[PDB]
Amino acid sequence: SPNYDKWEMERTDITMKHKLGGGQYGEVYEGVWKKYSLTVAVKTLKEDTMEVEEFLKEAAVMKEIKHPNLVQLLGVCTREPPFYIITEFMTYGNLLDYLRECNRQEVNAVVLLYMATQISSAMEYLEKKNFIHRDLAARNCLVGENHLVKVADFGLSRLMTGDTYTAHAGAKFPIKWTAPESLAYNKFSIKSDVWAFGVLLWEIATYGMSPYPGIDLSQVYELLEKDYRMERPEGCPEKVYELMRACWQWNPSDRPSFAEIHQAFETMFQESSISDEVEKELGKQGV
């Protein structure tokens, strides 16, 4: 069979539970895959099916990639019109929703920088293999136990060339995460995804606050096109802000690579990562 998947397993082997985002995250449910007795996340695609392209693409990428910092496929069911995408159960939900509802005393600056390190590592796997996310965001990242964050699919595609305008019409969901270049010309590149990563860095440092909050959506386009980019989050280190602002560099040719971004995280997280040379802790972000 041409649409067969060894990842495709019997739906009957899963007992569904509570919906994890049936309200405003799609038709997402909790389940348990009986033959392993492990709790799972189940995406159904029955009702509105606004983006069959994007959910079916999630299955396609997860079969071509596997890493603990990319949401790992547990199975699928694409043999049936109500398409299912089965993944791991992440305890704390989306990174966006977690940070907004988390205890900032526990989930402090030091973990927040570490999330950005895990995510830049995750993206580096994709970029190495010529995959692109083009839609990178805290809502498109997940968090589980041991403060573990991982990047997800959500419009994850193959970059291949990244030779400008590499897209498929609806190649974005969140407008405030979409680059000025991508708003004006609908053009995506690896540098347009670097913008989305910068907005994600902002989200993490602001405990999940929305980019450019309180300014009108019809004005978002205007300001981003006039080279506007978010300011330093309160409690965010200067060193991280240099990186963050660089991800929002106006010229794509002057904008940093994932190589340069990774080295920036790697040096900063070995000021914090030592966790031994610094006695009596290091770094306190209040609010």
- DSSP string across 162-173: --S----SS--S
Where along the chain do its domains lie? 11-88, 93-272
Is 88 assigned a ligand-binding role in the annotation?
yes
Among candidate residues 183, 188, 200, 198, the one with its CA nearest the CA of residue 139: 200
Which residues, including other chains, have CB under 8 Å from residue 57's CB and lie 6 or more apart? Answer: 153, 155, 156, 157
Host H or E run for residue 197:
helix 190-205
Which residues, including other chains, have CB under 8 Å from residue 149's CB and lie 6 or more apart? Answer: 69, 95, 115, 118, 119, 141, 142, 143
Q: What is the CATH architecture of 93-272?
A: Orthogonal Bundle (1.10)
Token pair in block for residue 75: 């199975």
Is 90 assigned a ligand-binding role in the annotation?
yes
Find tokens 């200067």 and name the residue. Answer: 238
Find tokens 């193959």 and name the residue. Answer: 158
Domains 11-88 and 93-272 share a fold: no
Residue positions annotated with a catalytic role: 135
Among candidate residues 148, 145, 94, 152, the one with its CA nearest the CA of residue 123: 152
Is 91 assigned a ligand-binding role in the annotation?
yes
* Pair type for strands 27-33 and 38-45: antiparallel
Is 285 assigned a ligand-binding role in the annotation?
no
The b-or-e profile of 102-112 (16+ CB within 10 A means b, else e) is beeeebbbbbb
Question: Crossing angle of helices 238-247/190-205, nearest 10°?
Answer: 150
Is 206 assigned a ligand-binding role in the annotation?
no
CATH superfamily of 11-88: Phosphorylase Kinase; domain 1 (3.30.200.20)
Q: In the beta sheet, which residues pair with residue 67? A: 70
Is 43 assigned a ligand-binding role in the annotation?
yes
Is 170 assigned a ligand-binding role in the annotation?
no
Which residues, including other chains, have CB under 8 Å from residue 127's CB and lie 6 or more apart? Answer: 159, 190, 258
Find tokens 């580096």 and name the residue. Answer: 124
List C-alpha distances in Å: 206 to 99, 141, 186, 196.
9, 15, 28, 15
